[PDB]
């Protein structure tokens, strides 16, 4: 009986794929050629922050443009001051091996995780005036990968588990269970409107799930090995994604299938975070060479280069304004360019 | 802006305090040794874990050795799915890998040794040293002395291998067993040799579950571990 | 899409010989390392050799150094495996493993759990 099921899914497959080659027709790249180069931009490190003990794993940008936290491993999150480089909160984390954090859009709350398989909330803003856990997250079963605030209350996690689920701050509880990925999730990447959430789970493929509806609305299957980084276009309705092929490819939703790839013969390593800027023309993409290439969105040229790192490049982020962007490495130094 | 030169004090003020703390951490990281406990299922890990230490995903074994502050990390509770989350643990001083000797046959002796193989050419864990705990000796003697379970029949290797002249054997112990010993860590060392060294290096120590020596045998190799880290310095 | 399908496999009495065959797509077969990985009935995955990406380092298990030959050509994306002695203990679906990521030799496809690089396997068995 397995070979019926099985051979249905190969018929459905192949009804897919021909319904997406039938919408292919053109091709971004041809259609951009006309569009003008970026160039080339001599990027340079403006702030250097120091003061993280171990390798820095995660990193996200807060609303406001001039907070931001970043997790390292040595049990510690600190949250540090853009312009003035002064370190606003040092969060010691219970767990040591923290993989992911999270700075809240209001910045009343922040999140990070785990080896521990726990999401520990902290609030930075308690009438003490100190940091305490808020809520810890311990349903999951796997390492805590990335974590993306909804709201004040509401939080997307991903998980080792290979399953993403919403938690509700408030109670604490499991609201929606995210199923479908074959292996562990790593990066999360939530949209504009916080309505929809796509991430990779090292089987070179794409989910695009519904924060309310939580299901599997799209699949997308162009990288070739494990992603380890995911994020949205500026507008919502595409988002790059990558992977150990050393290769980024942006995917669209409406399209619902790749639509350009940009890549390069000497680059062979993988890829641990991908980002884009306000407008989207630059993706800038962190690679384990311990530098990371700007790549254009367009014309899929490396506009620039930022080999100030000397460990492999961990997380990525452009704040929301895209005035700096600071890239993290395994060097305990972030550096923040423009 | 008076008021905001004001909080610019207060700001620095607060970053001072937080670099002060900051040192401190330093200052007991530095002198904590993290390590990691790796090993199949079957094998006797958990004992040795139970030993040192007399739902989360991973559990911190906080112990010391010599005035030594030593955190041997379990990471139970994980799925098997190792190249991703193993990445983390490259700073790590050394990781205690044990292998049930006598776990061979399906044949786990060879998943371990393919995982041994993994950790040592992961890119990230190059420059980690692996400390081999050849654990369960004593079924491995049992089974070789008394028993059919020819280790020809799953590894024909074995049918040409002899005792190395370096061989220590222990008072008393068949000369079969310290055959059958030094063969499957001859199997550990050809991995490690020939796929790369200078930068990591591995310590096979025959030990049991029950034997107390397992924390000397770690701090030893801390040790030495630290001495050859050391010993990079004086290259200019 | 990752697509793995093997092929070879069906019933043949002890001391006969086989040749599986697996069908690589959407991926460069020339930069990731192939393992062979069989899971006989009512046990779990075993590991049985692996081919080096260009094919100069080859390995077998001990069970079947010396009776079976794995090659490959990357001229046409194909594994195989030549099987030349087999016995009853043979009987294990065999499949098709491939390398996590690319210009690396740690491979993970052991792993119990539902890996995401291997195909859905051909069924060998072997009985007088």
């Known amino acids: 009986e397995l070979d019926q099921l099985r051979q249905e899914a190969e018929q459905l497959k192949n009804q897919i794929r021909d319904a997406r080659k039938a919408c292919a027709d053109a091709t971004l790249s041809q259609i951009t050629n006309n569009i003008d180069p970026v160039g080339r931009i001599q990027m340079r490190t403006r702030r250097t922050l120091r003061g993280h003990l171990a390798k820095i794993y995660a990193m996200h940008w807060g609303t406001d443009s001039r907070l931001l936290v970043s997790a390292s491993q040595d049990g510690k999150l600190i949250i540090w001051d853009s312009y003035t480089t002064n370190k606003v909160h040092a969060i010691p984390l219970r767990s040591s091996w923290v993989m992911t954090c999270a700075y809240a859009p209001s910045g009343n709350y922040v999140a990070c995780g785990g080896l521990d398989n726990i999401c520990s909330i902290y609030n930075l803003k308690t009438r003490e005036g100190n940091v305490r856990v808020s809520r810890e997250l311990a349903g999951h079963t796997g390492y805590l990968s990335c974590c993306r605030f909804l709201d004040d209350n509401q939080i997307v996690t991903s998980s080792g588990d290979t399953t993403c689920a919403l938690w509700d701050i408030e109670t604490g509880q499991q609201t929606t269970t995210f199923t479908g990925h074959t292996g562990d999730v790593m990066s999360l990447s939530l949209a504009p409107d916080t309505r929809l959430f796509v991430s990779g789970a090292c089987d070179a493929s794409a989910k695009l799930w519904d924060v309310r509806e939580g299901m599997c609305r799209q699949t997308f299957t162009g990288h070739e090995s494990d992603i380890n980084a995911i994020c949205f276009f500026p507008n919502g309705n595409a988002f790059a994604t990558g992977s150990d092929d050393a290769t980024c490819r942006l995917f669209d939703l409406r399209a619902d299938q790749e639509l350009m790839t940009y890549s390069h013969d000497n680059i062979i390593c993988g890829i641990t975070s991908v980002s884009f800027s306000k407008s989207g023309r630059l993706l800038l993409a962190g690679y384990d060479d311990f530098n990371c290439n700007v790549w254009d969105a367009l014309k899929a040229d490396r506009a620039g280069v930022l080999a100030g790192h000397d460990n492999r490049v961990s997380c990525l982020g452009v704040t929301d304004d895209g005035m700096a962007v600071a890239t993290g490495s395994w060097d305990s130094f972030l550096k923040i360019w423009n | 802006t008076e008021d905001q030169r004001n909080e610019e004090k207060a700001q620095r003020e607060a970053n001072k305090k937080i670099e002060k703390q900051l040192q401190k951490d330093k200052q007991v990281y530095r002198a904590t040794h993290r390590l990691l406990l790796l090993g199949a299922g079957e094998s006797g890990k958990n004992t040795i874990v139970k030993q040192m230490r007399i739902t989360s995903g991973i559990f911190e074994t906080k112990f010391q050795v010599d005035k030594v502050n030593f955190h041997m990390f379990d990471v139970g509770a994980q799925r098997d799915e190792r190249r991703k989350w193993i990445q983390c643990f490259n700073d790590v001083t050394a990781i205690i890998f044990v292998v049930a000797s006598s776990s061979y046959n399906t044949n786990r002796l060879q998943a371990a040794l393919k995982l041994f193989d993994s950790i040592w050419n992961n890119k990230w864990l190059r420059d980690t040293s692996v400390i081999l705990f050849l654990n369960k000796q004593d079924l491995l003697a049992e089974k070789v002395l008394a028993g059919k379970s020819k280790i020809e029949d799953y590894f024909p290797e074995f049918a040409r291998y002899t005792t190395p002249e370096d061989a220590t054997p222990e008072p008393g112990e068949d000369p079969r067993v310290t055959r059958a010993k030094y063969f499957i860590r001859d199997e550990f060392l050809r991995i490690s040799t020939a796929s790369g060294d200078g930068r990591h290096y591995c310590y096979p120590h025959f030990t049991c579950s029950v034997d107390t020596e397992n924390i000397r045998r770690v701090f030893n190799d801390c040790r030495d571990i630290i001495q050859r880290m050391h010993l990079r310095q004086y290259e200019l | 899409q990752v697509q793995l399908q093997e092929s070879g496999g069906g019933l043949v009495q002890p001391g006969g010989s086989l040749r599986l065959s697996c069908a690589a797509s959407?991926?460069?077969?020339?930069?990731?390392?192939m393992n062979w990985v069989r899971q006989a009935p009512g046990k779990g995955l075993e590991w049985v050799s692996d081919?080096?990406?260009?094919?100069?380092?080859?390995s077998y298990t001990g069970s079947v150094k010396g009776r079976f030959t794995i090659s490959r050509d990357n001229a046409k994306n194909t594994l195989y495996l030549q099987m030349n002695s087999l016995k009853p203990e043979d009987t294990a679906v065999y499949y098709c493993?491939?390398?996590?990521?690319?210009?690396?030799?740690?491979?993970?496809?052991?792993?119990?759990?539902?890996?995401?690089?291997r195909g859905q396997g051909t069924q060998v068995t072997v009985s007088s």
């Open positions: 959407g991926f460069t077969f020339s930069n990731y390392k």
């Open positions: 081919i080096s990406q260009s094919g100069a380092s080859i």
């Open positions: 493993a491939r390398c996590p990521a690319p210009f690396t030799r740690d491979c993970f496809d052991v792993t119990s759990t539902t890996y995401a690089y």
